[PDB]
Amino acid sequence: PAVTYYRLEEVAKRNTAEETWMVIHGRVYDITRFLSEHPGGEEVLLEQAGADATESFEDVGHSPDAREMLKQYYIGDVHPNDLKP
Numbered sequence: 321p322a323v324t325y326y327r328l329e330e331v332a333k334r335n336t337a338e339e340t341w342m343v344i345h346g347r348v349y350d351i352t353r354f355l356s357e358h359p360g361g362e363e364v365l366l367e368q369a370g371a372d373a374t375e376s377f378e379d380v381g382h383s384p385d386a387r388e389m390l391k392q393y394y395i396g397d398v399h400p401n402d403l404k405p
């Protein structure tokens with residue numbers, strides 16, 4: 321299978337509105353175009369851009385519909401050596 325992998329070092333560089341990546345559950349999402357659409361606003365996303373936002377994403381209690389949106393932004397998996405517990 322042709323899965324794309326990213327190191328966290330790479331993901332961390334995509335930390336502004338120019339190109340915004342985020343890790344949730346060991347996957348990388350490019351949410352650049354979603355910033356202006358996110359119901360929770362842009363700032364909560366930018367504050368964790370380039371980082372692992374799993375804990376915040378889960379703590380907010382996002383709906384099943386919100387979760388299903390992730391397929392629009394998925395760009396690859398975190399490299400296995402860089403996965404969080």
Ligand code: HEM
Pocket residue numbers: 349351358359360361364365368373376377380381382383385386387389390393
């Ligand atoms: C790709 C990532 C994300 C997607 C697709 C997403 C999607 C959504 C959606 C659909 C809503 C509307 C409410 C719902 O359906 O549950 C929402 C609201 C909200 N989101 Fe997100 N979200 C993402 C990431 C985040 C993150 C990382 C945070 C916090 C750091 C956050 C904070 C909030 C807040 C505060 C609201 C409104 C208040 C609430 O729903 O309790 N979101 N988001």
